[PDB]
Amino acid sequence: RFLKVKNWETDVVLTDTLHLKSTLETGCTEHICMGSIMLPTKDQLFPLAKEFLDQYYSSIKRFGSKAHMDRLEEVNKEIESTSTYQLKDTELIYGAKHAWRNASRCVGRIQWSKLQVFDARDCTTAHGMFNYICNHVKYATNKGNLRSAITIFPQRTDGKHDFRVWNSQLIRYAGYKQPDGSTLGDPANVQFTEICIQQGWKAPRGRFDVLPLLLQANGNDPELFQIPPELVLEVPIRHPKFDWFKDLGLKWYGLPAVSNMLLEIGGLEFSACPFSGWYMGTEIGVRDYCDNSRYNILEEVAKKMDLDMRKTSSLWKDQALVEINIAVLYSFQSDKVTIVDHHSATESFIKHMENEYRCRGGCPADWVWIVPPMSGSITPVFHQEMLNYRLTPSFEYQPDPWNTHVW
Amino acid sequence: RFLKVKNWETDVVLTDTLHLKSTLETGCTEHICMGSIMLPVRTKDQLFPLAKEFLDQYYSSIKRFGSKAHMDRLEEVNKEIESTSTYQLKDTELIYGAKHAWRNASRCVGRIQWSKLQVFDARDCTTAHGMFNYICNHVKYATNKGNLRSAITIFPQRTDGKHDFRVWNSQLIRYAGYKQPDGSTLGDPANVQFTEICIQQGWKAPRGRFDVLPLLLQANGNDPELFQIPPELVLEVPIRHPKFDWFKDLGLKWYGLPAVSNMLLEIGGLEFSACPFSGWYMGTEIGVRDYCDNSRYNILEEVAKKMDLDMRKTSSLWKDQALVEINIAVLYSFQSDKVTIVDHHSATESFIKHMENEYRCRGGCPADWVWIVPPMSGSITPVFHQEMLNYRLTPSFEYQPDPWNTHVWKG
Numbered sequence: 001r002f003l004k005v006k007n008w009e010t011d012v013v014l015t016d017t018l019h020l021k022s023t024l025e026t027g028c029t030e031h032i033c034m035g036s037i038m039l040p041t042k043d044q045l046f047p048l049a050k051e052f053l054d055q056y057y058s059s060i061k062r063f064g065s066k067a068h069m070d071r072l073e074e075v076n077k078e079i080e081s082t083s084t085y086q087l088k089d090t091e092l093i094y095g096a097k098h099a100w101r102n103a104s105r106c107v108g109r110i111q112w113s114k115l116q117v118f119d120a121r122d123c124t125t126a127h128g129m130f131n132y133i134c135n136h137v138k139y140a141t142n143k144g145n146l147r148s149a150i151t152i153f154p155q156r157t158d159g160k161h162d163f164r165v166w167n168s169q170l171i172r173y174a175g176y177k178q179p180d181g182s183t184l185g186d187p188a189n190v191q192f193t194e195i196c197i198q199q200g201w202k203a204p205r206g207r208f209d210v211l212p213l214l215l216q217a218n219g220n221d222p223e224l225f226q227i228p229p230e231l232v233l234e235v236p237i238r239h240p241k242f243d244w245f246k247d248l249g250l251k252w253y254g255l256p257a258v259s260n261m262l263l264e265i266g267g268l269e270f271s272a273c274p275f276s277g278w279y280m281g282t283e284i285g286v287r288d289y290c291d292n293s294r295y296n297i298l299e300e301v302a303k304k305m306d307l308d309m310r311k312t313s314s315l316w317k318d319q320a321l322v323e324i325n326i327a328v329l330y331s332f333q334s335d336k337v338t339i340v341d342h343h344s345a346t347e348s349f350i351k352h353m354e355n356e357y358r359c360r361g362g363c364p365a366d367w368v369w370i371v372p373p374m375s376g377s378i379t380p381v382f383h384q385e386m387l388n389y390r391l392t393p394s395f396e397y398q399p400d401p402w403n404t405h406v407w
Numbered sequence: 408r409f410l411k412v413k414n415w416e417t418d419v420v421l422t423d424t425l426h427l428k429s430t431l432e433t434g435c436t437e438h439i440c441m442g443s444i445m446l447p448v449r450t451k452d453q454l455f456p457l458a459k460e461f462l463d464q465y466y467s468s469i470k471r472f473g474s475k476a477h478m479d480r481l482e483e484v485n486k487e488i489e490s491t492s493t494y495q496l497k498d499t500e501l502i503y504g505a506k507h508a509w510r511n512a513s514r515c516v517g518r519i520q521w522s523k524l525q526v527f528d529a530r531d532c533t534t535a536h537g538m539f540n541y542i543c544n545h546v547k548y549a550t551n552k553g554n555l556r557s558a559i560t561i562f563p564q565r566t567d568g569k570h571d572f573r574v575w576n577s578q579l580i581r582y583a584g585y586k587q588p589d590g591s592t593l594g595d596p597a598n599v600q601f602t603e604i605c606i607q608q609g610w611k612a613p614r615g616r617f618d619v620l621p622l623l624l625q626a627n628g629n630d631p632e633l634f635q636i637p638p639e640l641v642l643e644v645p646i647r648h649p650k651f652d653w654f655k656d657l658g659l660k661w662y663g664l665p666a667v668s669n670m671l672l673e674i675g676g677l678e679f680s681a682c683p684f685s686g687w688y689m690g691t692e693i694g695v696r697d698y699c700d701n702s703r704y705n706i707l708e709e710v711a712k713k714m715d716l717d718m719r720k721t722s723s724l725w726k727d728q729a730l731v732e733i734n735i736a737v738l739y740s741f742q743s744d745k746v747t748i749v750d751h752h753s754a755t756e757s758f759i760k761h762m763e764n765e766y767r768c769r770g771g772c773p774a775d776w777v778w779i780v781p782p783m784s785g786s787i788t789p790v791f792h793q794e795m796l797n798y799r800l801t802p803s804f805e806y807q808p809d810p811w812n813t814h815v816w817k818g
C-alpha cells in the first residue's frame with residue numbers, strides 16, 4: 001500500500017503511491033504471475049465519467065469548484081437522457097495525453113505532454129477518415145522532423161456503429177504467400193494483405209509494398225484508399241562502413257503510427273484513434289529485420305560479414321545484430337528523420353520515472369516491454385524494478401475488426 | 408482450471424495445470440504485477456501438512472502412492488513431529504527433494520539438467536572445520552578438472568533457528584573488492600562489504616583485482632570461522648579473444664565454478680539454510696553482468712577504447728559492439744581450456760525443449776521471464792517470444808537475509 005522500487009545499479013529507491021488509484025485488472029494473482037502474457041448500460045458510465053472529471057478538475061487546480069460541480073451535473077443529465085455524453089475539447093486533449101502518460105509499455109513517455117491532438121469527432125464517412133489520416137501523416141512526419149500526434153474519430157455508441165482503421169499501423173509493408181513456400185515482404189501482414197486484395201487491392205507483389213488503408217465509418221463496410229506516396233517518407237538502409245549493406249535492398253518507413261488501439265476516456269470508447277511518434281532504432285533493426293517471423297535477415301547479413309556460422313558460440317547472430325542496428329540508426333540520422341537509440345531512450349525513461357515518482361507518486365511500467373530486445377543489462381532500465389498497473393484514461397488492445405465485423 | 412501460454416514466434420500453445428499445485432505467494436495481485444521486483448522457528452502445528460504434501464509427492468513419483476510403505480512413513484513422521492517437534496528425511500527423500508527444488512526453480516534457465524544432480528548429504532556435520540572439508544570435496548568433485556558436474560551439499564536443517572548452519576559467502580568462489588580512499592574499487596565491487604567482514608575476521612588480503620575470498624563458515628549457530636580454499640582446487644580461466652591479441656593484456660580471468668551458497672532449501676517444511684550448489688556458467692553471466700555491469704568490473708570503456716570505436720555518441724552502439732566481443736572472448740577462453748560453459752543461444756534453446764517436455768509430462772513449468780531471457784541479444788533467443796507462467800512449487804530455493812544482519816555474536 002506504499003510499495004517501493006529499487007534500482008540495483010544506483011541504489012536509488014522510489015516510493016509508489018500512485019498504484020492505489022489503479023482501476024483495471026492486470027492478469028496476475030498472488031498465486032500466478034502473468035507478467036509475460038501479451039494479452040491477459042447507463043449505470044456503468046457515470047461513475048467512470050465522474051472518476052475522470054474529478055481527475056481533470058484536480059489537475060487544473062479547480063477541484064471542488066463551481067465549474068467542477070456544474071460539469072458533473074451536466075454530464076449526469078446527458079447520460080440519463082442520451083445513453084452517453086460528449087467530452088469538451090480540453091477534456092479530450094487531457095484524456096489523450098494521459099492515456100499516453102499511462103501506457104506502462106511505452107518507453108517514450110518523457111514526451112507525453114507534447115502530443116498534438118486532432119479532434120476528428122465530426123467525421124462521418126470513410127473518405128472523411130482518409131482525409132483526416134492524410135493530414136495526420138503529413139503533420140506528424142513534418143519532412144523528417146517527426147512530431148507526436150493522435151487523431152480521434154467518434155466514440156462508440158450502440159457498438160455496431162464503430163469507427164475503425166483496419167490496418168494495425170497507418171504505414172506497413174504487404175505480405176504474400178508464395179508458390180515457392182517462403183513469404184515475400186512482411187510475414188506479419190499476410191492475413192491483412194489478403195483481405196485487402198479480396199476487397200479489390202491491386203497488389204504490386206513486392207517485398208516493400210506500402211499497404212492501402214482500409215477504413216470503416218459508422219459501423220459501415222470498410223473501404224480502400226492508397227496513402228499519397230508523396231506522404232509516406234521512407235528510408236533506404238545503408239551501413240557507415242559496410243559498403244555492401246545497401247545491396248540487401250532494405251528500406252523502412254519513418255513514421256510509426258499505431259492504429260488498431262482503443263482509447264478509453266472517462267468511460268467512453270474511441271475505437272479509432274491512430275497515434276504516432278518516432279522510432280527507437282531497435283524496433284526496426286532488432287524486431288522488424290531480425291525476428292524469425294519477420295524479414296529475418298540475420299543469416300543473409302552474417303553471410304556477407306563472413307562470420308563463422310558453424311556453431312552458436314561464435315555469436316555470429318549477435319555480431320550481425322549489432323551492425324544491422326548501427327545501419328538503421330546511421331541511415332535515419334543521415335536522412336534527418338527523427339530516431340532515438342535504445343541507450344538514449346531508456347536513459348530518458350529513467351529520468352521520466354524519477355519525475356513521475358516525485359510529481360505523481362509513481363509510474364506504471366511493464367519491465368518485459370520497457371527493456372530493449374538487445375543489450376538489456378547495459379541500458380539502465382534493466383536494473384530498475386518497475387511496478388505495472390492499469391490506470392485510466394488508457395490505450396487498450398482490441399479484436400481485429402474482421403473477426404467481429406458483420407459484412 | 409487450465410491456462411495457456413503462446414509462443415509468438417512459433418504459434419505453439421501449451422496448457423498449464425501444474426499451477427493448481429501451487430502454494431507460496433507471488434507478490435503480485437489482480438491490481439499490481441511485481442514480476443520485476445528482485446525480492447517478491449516453525450511451530451509443530453504447521454509442519455505435518457507440509458511433510459504430508461511432500462511425502463505424498465515423493466511416494467507418487469516412486470509409484471508407491473497409498474502403499475504400506477507410504478502410510479507407515481506418514482505415521483512415522485507424524486510421531487517424530489509430536490515427539491521432537493521436527494523430523495528427519497531419508498536419504499532418498501533428500502535427493503528427491505533437492506532435485507525438485509532445482510526443477511521448481513523458475514528463474515533457472517539450466518533446468519533441462521535437473522535430473523542429474525549429485526547430492527552430498529552433509530547432515531552429520533557438526534563444526535565449521537567439518538563444513539570446510541565437505542565444501543572442498545564439493546568443489547573438487549564438481550570441477551572435475553574442467554568437466555563440470557552439477558552438485559549440492561546439504562548441511563543440517565534449521566532447528567530452533569538459534570543453531571543455524573550458514574555459508575556467509577554468496578558463492579563459494581568469488582573475488583574480493585576493496586573500496587579505496589579515492590572512491591574507486593579494486594576487484595569486484597559487489598563483494599566490498601563481505602570482503603570487509605573477511606578482513607575484520609582476520610583474513611590477510613593480497614589486495615589484487617582477482618583475489619579468491621576465503622570461506623566464512625558458521626556451524627550450529629556459532630560464530631563463523633575463516634578458511635582459504637586450496638588454490639589448487641580453484642579452477643580459473645584467463646580471458647583472451649580469438650582475433651584480438653590485445654584482449655589478454657586487459658589482465659582478466661574468471662573462475663570456472665559457479666556455486667551459490669546463500670540460499671535456503673525448503674523440503675517438506677524443513678529448512679536447510681546452508682545448501683551450496685553449483686553447475687556451470689552461461690557465458691553471459693560473466694561476459695555481460697560480471698564484466699559489463701557499471702557496478703561490477705565495468706570494462707566496456709576500456710575495451711571499446713582498445714577497439715577504436717566511435718565513443719562520442721551512444722548511437723554508434725559502441726557499447727553494444729564491445730559487449731559482444733567480450734562475450735565472444737569468455738566463451739572462446741572457456742572452450743580452449745576445456746572448461747564446461749554454455750552460450751545463451753544454446754542455453755535458451757535447451758530450455759525451450761525442457762519447458763515443452765515438462766508441460767507434456769508434468770502439466771507445466773514455472774518460469775520467470777525477467778530472469779530466463781538472457782541480458783544481451785534478448786529477441787534472437789527463442790525464450791524472448793515465449794509466454795511463461797511464474798508460480799511457486801515446493802520443494803524450492805529461497806532467498807534468505809545475509810547472516811551478518813541476523814547473527815547474534817557469541818564473542
Ligand code: HEM
Binds near residue numbers: 280395
Ligand atoms: C515519441 C516517441 C515514442 C517512442 C520512442 C515510443 C516508444 C515505444 C516502444 C519502444 C514501445 C514498445 C513497442 C513495441 O515493441 O511494439 C512502445 C509502446 C507503446 N507506446 Fe510508445 N513511443 C513513442 C510515442 C508514443 C505515443 C505518441 C503514444 C500515444 C499517443 C505511445 C503509446 C504507446 C502505447 C499505447 C504502446 C504499447 C502498444 C502495444 O501494446 O503494442 N507512444 N512505445
Ligand code: HEM
Binds near residue numbers: 520684685686688689
Ligand atoms: C547447468 C548449470 C546451470 C546453468 C547454466 C544455470 C543457469 C542459470 C542462470 C543463467 C541463472 C540466473 C543467473 C543470475 O542472474 O544470477 C540461474 C538461476 C538459478 N539457478 Fe541455475 N543453472 C544451472 C544449474 C543449477 C543448479 C545445479 C541449481 C541448484 C540445484 C540451480 C538453481 C538456480 C536457482 C535457485 C537460480 C535463481 C538464483 C537467484 O534467485 O539468485 N541452477 N541458473
Ligand SMILES: Cc1cc(N)nc(C[C@@H]2CNC[C@@H]2OCCNCC(F)(F)c2cccc(F)c2F)c1
Binds near residue numbers: 038257276280397
Ligand atoms: C498481438 C499484439 C498485442 C499488442 N498489445 N500489441 C501488439 C503490437 C506488436 C508488439 N511488438 C511489435 C508490434 O508493435 C508494432 C507497433 N510498433 C510501433 C510502436 F508502438 F512501438 C511505436 C514506436 C515508436 C513510436 C510509436 F508511437 C509507436 F507507436 C501486438
Ligand SMILES: Cc1cc(N)nc(C[C@@H]2CNC[C@@H]2OCCNCC(F)(F)c2cccc(F)c2F)c1
Binds near residue numbers: 446578665685687
Ligand atoms: C538480491 C538477490 C536476490 C536473488 N534471488 N538472487 C540474487 C543473486 C544475484 C542474481 N544475479 C546476480 C547474483 O547472482 C550471482 C550468482 N549467480 C550464479 C547463477 F545462479 F546464476 C548460476 C549460474 C550457472 C550455474 C549455477 F549453478 C548458478 F547457480 C540477488
Ligand SMILES: C[C@H](O)[C@H](O)[C@H]1CNc2nc(N)[nH]c(=O)c2N1
Binds near residue numbers: 382383384445777779
Ligand atoms: C530489476 C530486475 O528485476 C533485476 O535487475 C533483474 C533483471 N533480470 C535478471 N536476470 C538474471 N538472470 N539475473 C539478474 O540478476 C537479473 N536482474
Ligand SMILES: C[C@H](O)[C@H](O)[C@H]1CNc2nc(N)[nH]c(=O)c2N1
Binds near residue numbers: 037038368791792794
Ligand atoms: C512473450 C513476450 O511477452 C513477448 O515476446 C513480448 C516480450 N517483450 C516485448 N517487448 C516489446 N517492447 N515489444 C514486444 O513486442 C515484446 N514482446
Ligand SMILES: [Zn+2]
Binds near residue numbers: 028035439440441
Ligand atoms: Zn505478475
